[PDB]
Amino acid sequence: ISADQVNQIIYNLHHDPFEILGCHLLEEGKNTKKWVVRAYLPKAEAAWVIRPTERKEDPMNSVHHPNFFECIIETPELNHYQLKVKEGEHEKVIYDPYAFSSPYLTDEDIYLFSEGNHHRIYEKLGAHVGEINGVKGVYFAVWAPNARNVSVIGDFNNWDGREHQMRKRNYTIWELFVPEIGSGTVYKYEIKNSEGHIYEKSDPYGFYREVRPNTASIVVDIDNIYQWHDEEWLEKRRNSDPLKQPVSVYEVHLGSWLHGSSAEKMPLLNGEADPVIVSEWNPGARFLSYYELAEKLIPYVKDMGYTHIELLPIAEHPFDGSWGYQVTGFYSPTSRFGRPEDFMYFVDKCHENGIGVILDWVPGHFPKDSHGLAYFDGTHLYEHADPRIGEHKEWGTLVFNYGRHEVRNFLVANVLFWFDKYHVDGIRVDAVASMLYRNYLRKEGEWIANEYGGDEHIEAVSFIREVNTLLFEYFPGILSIAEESTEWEKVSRPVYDGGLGFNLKWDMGWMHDMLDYFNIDPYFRQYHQNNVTFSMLYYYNENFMLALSHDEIVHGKSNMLGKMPGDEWQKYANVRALFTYMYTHPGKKTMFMSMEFGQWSEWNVNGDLEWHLLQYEPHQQLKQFFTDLNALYQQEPALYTHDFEYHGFEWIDCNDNTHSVVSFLRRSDDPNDSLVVVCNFTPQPHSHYRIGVPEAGYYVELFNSDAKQYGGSNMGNLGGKWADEWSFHNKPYSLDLCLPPLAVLILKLDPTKVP
Numbered sequence: 001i002s003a004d005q006v007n008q009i010i011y012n013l014h015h016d017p018f019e020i021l022g023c024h025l026l027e028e029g030k031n032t033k034k035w036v037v038r039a040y041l042p043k044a045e046a047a048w049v050i051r052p053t054e055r056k057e058d059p060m061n062s063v064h065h066p067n068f069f070e071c072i073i074e075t076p077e078l079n080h081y082q083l084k085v086k087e088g089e090h091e092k093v094i095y096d097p098y099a100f101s102s103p104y105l106t107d108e109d110i111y112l113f114s115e116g117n118h119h120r121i122y123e124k125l126g127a128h129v130g131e132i133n134g135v136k137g138v139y140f141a142v143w144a145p146n147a148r149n150v151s152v153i154g155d156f157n158n159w160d161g162r163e164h165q166m167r168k169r170n171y172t173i174w175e176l177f178v179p180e181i182g183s184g185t186v187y188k189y190e191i192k193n194s195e196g197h198i199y200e201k202s203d204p205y206g207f208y209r210e211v212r213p214n215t216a217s218i219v220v221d222i223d224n225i226y227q228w229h230d231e232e233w234l235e236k237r238r239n240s241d242p243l244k245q246p247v248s249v250y251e252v253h254l255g256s257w258l259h260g261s262s263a264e265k266m267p268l269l270n271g272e273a274d275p276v277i278v279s280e281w282n283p284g285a286r287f288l289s290y291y292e293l294a295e296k297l298i299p300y301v302k303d304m305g306y307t308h309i310e311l312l313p314i315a316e317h318p319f320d321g322s323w324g325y326q327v328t329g330f331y332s333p334t335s336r337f338g339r340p341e342d343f344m345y346f347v348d349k350c351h352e353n354g355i356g357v358i359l360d361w362v363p364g365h366f367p368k369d370s371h372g373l374a375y376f377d378g379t380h381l382y383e384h385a386d387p388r389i390g391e392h393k394e395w396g397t398l399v400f401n402y403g404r405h406e407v408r409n410f411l412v413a414n415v416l417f418w419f420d421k422y423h424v425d426g427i428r429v430d431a432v433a434s435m436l437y438r439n440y441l442r443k444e445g446e447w448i449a450n451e452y453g454g455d456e457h458i459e460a461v462s463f464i465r466e467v468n469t470l471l472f473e474y475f476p477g478i479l480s481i482a483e484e485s486t487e488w489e490k491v492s493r494p495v496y497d498g499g500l501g502f503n504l505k506w507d508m509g510w511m512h513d514m515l516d517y518f519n520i521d522p523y524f525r526q527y528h529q530n531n532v533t534f535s536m537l538y539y540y541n542e543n544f545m546l547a548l549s550h551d552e553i554v555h556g557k558s559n560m561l562g563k564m565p566g567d568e569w570q571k572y573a574n575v576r577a578l579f580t581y582m583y584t585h586p587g588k589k590t591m592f593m594s595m596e597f598g599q600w601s602e603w604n605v606n607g608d609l610e611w612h613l614l615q616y617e618p619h620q621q622l623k624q625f626f627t628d629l630n631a632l633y634q635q636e637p638a639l640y641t642h643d644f645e646y647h648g649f650e651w652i653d654c655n656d657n658t659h660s661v662v663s664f665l666r667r668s669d670d671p672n673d674s675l676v677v678v679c680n681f682t683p684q685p686h687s688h689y690r691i692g693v694p695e696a697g698y699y700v701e702l703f704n705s706d707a708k709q710y711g712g713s714n715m716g717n718l719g720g721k722w723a724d725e726w727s728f729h730n731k732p733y734s735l736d737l738c739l740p741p742l743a744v745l746i747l748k749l750d751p752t753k754v755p
């Protein structure tokens with residue numbers, strides 16, 4: 001380009017910067033094409049064009065001005081890129097602000113979508129504020145290839161669509177531009193199918209929705225409602241390996257953590273809305289907004305010391321009792337708790353306080369509700385038409401057709417959507433088996449095999465691989481967590497090694513061993529020592545997340561205290577011993593709200609947590625316990641650097657089943673960070689109990705779950721102990737310990753202590 005064209009951009013004289021900025025074709029070769037990307041990045045010294053799906057990166061060069069950049073790239077198609085922008089010591093990675101010159105669908109958009117490869121389809125499908133023919137308005141577009149007609153109905157035409165009939169393009173997508181309406185417009189699509197029957201649909205790609213049970217979509221100007229402050233958090237995430245960090249997750253259902261009074265409005269970020277009553281049976285209570293949750297949940301979690309919050313599904317969902325797992329509005333955060341900008345604020349505030357956000361994401365099915373995706377255009381559009389692969393009959397839901405390109409694209413782009421517009425740090429996918437198996441909860445004769453005669457749902461496996469491949473490429477450093485309950489291999493290994501591509505998997509076997517173990521009367525635990533140690537046999541086949549989740553404190557399973565045998569003191573002691581063991585055992589950590597303060601009753605999604613219990617000392621002490629355990633977790637590298645390497649763990653001894661005692665080492669990069677952990681899983685203390693240790697010195701008591709400030713009886717080693725030169729458990733040195741009752745000790749050699 002010429003210096004005069006550059007100067008016209010720099011001094012804001014240019015008539016249309018899209019002519020020059022963004023991506024433009026320079027020429028066609030035989031097998032490839034040559035493109036230029038340009039950007040004006042005031043305050044950037046350097047920049048790069050990332051092609052994350054091709055694994056390439058190209059530097060940009062300054063041209064005529066130090067902040068005007070150009071990059072020439074040869075490739076057949078330049079559809080998927082990002083800009084990396086360096087301003088002083090900081091980098092950010094963004095989509096090109098000049099990627100799309102128009103609000104309407106181009107031929108390229110339609111072609112990529114038809115192939116299932118439009119990573120940003122939600123920039124053009126749904127409803128967006130823009131300008132067409134010189135007039136400001138909203139562009140609507142919806143995929144519905146077998147509809148006979150579609151119209152936009154809404155507040156602006158009194159729900160009569162006759163003069164807002166949409167125009168069909170390439171036999172596949174309906175569009176319409178409506179002048180002079182803007183954000184806040186309430187609308188649906190009125191679809192006529194092949195039979196002539198008329199229905200009303202929420203926008204599949206809608207960005208906001210009325211409060212359940214109403215279902216009209218609402219137009220949002222999603223790039224102009226919130227200003228973020230988390231560049232530094234995002235840069236740090238992109239540059240780190242989250243597998244080598246502490247990850248302690250507080251799992252939360254937003255609708256039932258804490259309620260407010262329905263006698264007042266719900267405050268929002270600079271505004272307010274009517275209260276959303278939690279149910280007709282409990283009309284005095286309302287949900288808290290995302291804004292109120294940012295003000296109360298976030299400091300509560302920060303002060304507990306968790307590194308992440310994991311949310312049960314916040315995509316829009318019509319029925320409270322699904323807990324979120326039956327979604328019909330995939331592209332909108334639930335209006336139960338306010339507006340999209342309120343949830344953006346929530347995320348931004350987590351990031352400011354050093355907390356990541358993991359979303360439960362539900363690509364596995366969707367319910368039949370008629371406002372939603374079902375039978376969308378009068379055909380089996382989103383769901384497979386054959387109920388043997390297209391319905392989960394036991395659940396009453398429909399299963400997406402993962403092999404259909406536009407359906408795959410709906411979901412692939414959806415996962416990217418949450419990382420792009422809402423800045424989240426990970427996803428967790430529930431019930432992955434339900435997607436992977438063609439015979440899932442289906443009896444003989446009621447499913448069919450894949451094309452090779454197997455049970456593998458080939459299209460689902462392929463979809464899942466694509467999700468994880470693209471997620472990590474576009475947003476490196478995130479968490480992608482699977483719960484998969486049948487022994488499928490390599491769930492949390494790279495797609496290039498034959499894996500499904502997650503980086504963490506819930507260790508469901510471990511959860512069952514532990515909760516079955518601690519439920520057994522302590523005298524009988526000697527017959528079940530294997531529960532304590534079995535999971536370390538297959539542990540290195542995946543990267544495990546140790547999760548004690550919501551699903552384990554409902555439906556008559558009891559909350560944590562209630563699972564435990566004995567009197568009140570022993571119930572608390574068992575909870576502390578179990579969780580000290582969970583936090584010292586290899587793997588990342590997840591626990592669910594209410595577990596951290598000893599709620600007696602099961603989680604009940606129609607009320608909120610029993611916060612009044614925190615008036616009383618026992619509950620306060622257990623909460624302090626978790627507060628201190630989380631701090632210890634972040635402070636001791638051997639609890640997190642080598643979770644997934646042999647070096648990070650070794651049993652010292654586990655043959656004392658008779659006393660239900662086990663002991664082990666944790667290690668990190670530095671040998672002086674090594675820990676010794678000793679567990680006593682009966683209420684019988686032991687007085688001069690020897691444990692081998694690998695070196696001489698003074699082993700400081702870092703943590704003792706029987707300390708009185710945790711509710712314990714206060715037995716212990718008085719702060720530490722000198723090792724003896726007394727071979728034991730095949731080790732040259734040994735500690736002669738007091739083992740407190742129903743308790744775990746964590747010890748660390750201080751090699752600078754003087755004898």
Ligand SMILES: OC[C@H]1O[C@H](O[C@H]2[C@H](O)[C@@H](O)[C@@H](O[C@H]3[C@H](O)[C@@H](O)[C@@H](O[C@H]4[C@H](O)[C@@H](O)[C@@H](O[C@H]5[C@H](O)[C@@H](O)[C@@H](O[C@H]6[C@H](O)[C@@H](O)[C@@H](O[C@H]7[C@H](O)[C@@H](O)[C@@H](O)O[C@@H]7CO)O[C@@H]6CO)O[C@@H]5CO)O[C@@H]4CO)O[C@@H]3CO)O[C@@H]2CO)[C@H](O)[C@@H](O)[C@@H]1O
Nearest residue numbers: 687701702703704705707708709714715716717718719738
């Ligand atoms: O994560 C929470 C928290 O955990 C740790 O802190 C805990 C401790 O783990 C826990 O034991 C306790 O320690 C407090 C203690 O309560 C305070 O009284 C004080 O301890 C004093 C002690 O009072 C002084 O006497 C002095 O101790 C001498 C001791 O008098 C002397 O006899 C000898 O002891 C040896 C003893 O003779 C042996 O028989 C044996 O003793 C065993 C018994 O065999 C056993 O049957 C059972 O009853 O317990 C005895 C204790 O092991 O071995 C003894 C060697 O240990 O030598 C000692 C050497 O001093 O000194 C200390 C002053 O240090 O302070 C301690 C330390 O705080 O409560 C705390 C908190 O609840 C962790 O330290 C902390 O960081 C964490 O926050």
Ligand SMILES: OC[C@H]1O[C@H](O[C@H]2[C@H](O)[C@@H](O)[C@@H](O[C@H]3[C@H](O)[C@@H](O)[C@@H](O[C@H]4[C@H](O)[C@@H](O)[C@@H](O)O[C@@H]4CO)O[C@@H]3CO)O[C@@H]2CO)[C@H](O)[C@@H](O)[C@@H]1O
Nearest residue numbers: 114116144145146170171172379381402403404405406407
């Ligand atoms: O109006 C003229 C034509 O209309 C009719 O064809 C329709 C079908 O009824 C629609 O359902 C649709 O079909 C698309 C489909 O939507 C799309 O996903 C893609 O299908 C792929 C699939 O994703 C992939 O997994 C694999 O199985 O291959 C499939 C076939 O390519 O493409 C379909 C075909 O276009 O759209 C058309 C057009 O509206 C009518 O049946 C035609 O005979 C008629 O000419």
Ligand SMILES: OC[C@H]1O[C@H](O[C@H]2[C@H](O)[C@@H](O)[C@@H](O[C@H]3[C@H](O)[C@@H](O)[C@@H](O[C@H]4[C@H](O)[C@@H](O)[C@@H](O)O[C@@H]4CO)O[C@@H]3CO)O[C@@H]2CO)[C@H](O)[C@@H](O)[C@@H]1O
Nearest residue numbers: 566567568569570682683684685712713714715740741742
């Ligand atoms: O000198 C004090 C004693 O030190 C050691 O006693 C231990 C027990 O061995 C441990 O099991 C534990 O005791 C728990 C006990 O397991 C539990 O059931 C509960 O018992 C209380 C009960 O809550 C209370 O309401 C009332 O019934 O009295 C019971 C007191 O026994 O709580 C106990 C702890 O408070 O810890 C103690 C103290 O460390 C040692 O083994 C004893 O020989 C010694 O006497």
Ligand SMILES: OC[C@H]1O[C@H](O[C@H]2[C@H](O)[C@@H](O)[C@@H](O[C@H]3[C@H](O)[C@@H](O)[C@@H](O[C@H]4[C@H](O)[C@@H](O)[C@@H](O)O[C@@H]4CO)O[C@@H]3CO)O[C@@H]2CO)[C@H](O)[C@@H](O)[C@@H]1O
Nearest residue numbers: 653654655656657658659686687688689690691692728729
């Ligand atoms: O009470 C007086 C005695 O107390 C002390 O003995 C303790 C040990 O210090 C503890 O380590 C433990 O002993 C365990 C041992 O740790 C464990 O490995 C297992 O020992 C098996 C062994 O693994 C196996 O190879 C084989 O050789 O048999 C061993 C004996 O069965 O189980 C042991 C406990 O049964 O607990 C004892 C107390 O029971 C002190 O050291 C004693 O000298 C003292 O008399």
Ligand SMILES: OC[C@H]1O[C@H](O[C@H]2[C@H](O)[C@@H](O)[C@@H](O[C@H]3[C@H](O)[C@@H](O)[C@@H](O)O[C@@H]3CO)O[C@@H]2CO)[C@H](O)[C@@H](O)[C@@H]1O
Nearest residue numbers: 153154155158159186187188200201210214215216217
């Ligand atoms: O104050 C007027 C009115 O506002 C609210 O009703 C709105 C609905 O919540 C909203 O869904 C929409 O209803 C349309 C349906 O979505 C559509 O499928 C079809 O059946 O037409 C409806 C419009 O007639 O609009 C209504 C009206 O704004 C509030 O909930 C009402 O009770 C209230 O009276």
Ligand SMILES: OC[C@H]1O[C@H](O[C@H]2[C@H](O)[C@@H](O)[C@@H](O[C@H]3[C@H](O)[C@@H](O)[C@@H](O)O[C@@H]3CO)O[C@@H]2CO)[C@H](O)[C@@H](O)[C@@H]1O
Nearest residue numbers: 529530531532533534535536537538539540650651654
């Ligand atoms: O080096 C082999 C192995 O050593 C350690 O594994 C021990 C287990 O952790 C422990 O549970 C036990 O395994 C037995 C099971 O408990 C039982 O249910 C059944 O399947 O038999 C198992 C056969 O041993 O003992 C093993 C072997 O010591 C360590 O934890 C591993 O990481 C390590 O690879």
Ligand SMILES: [Mg+2]
Nearest residue numbers: 607608609610
């Ligand atoms: Mg309540």
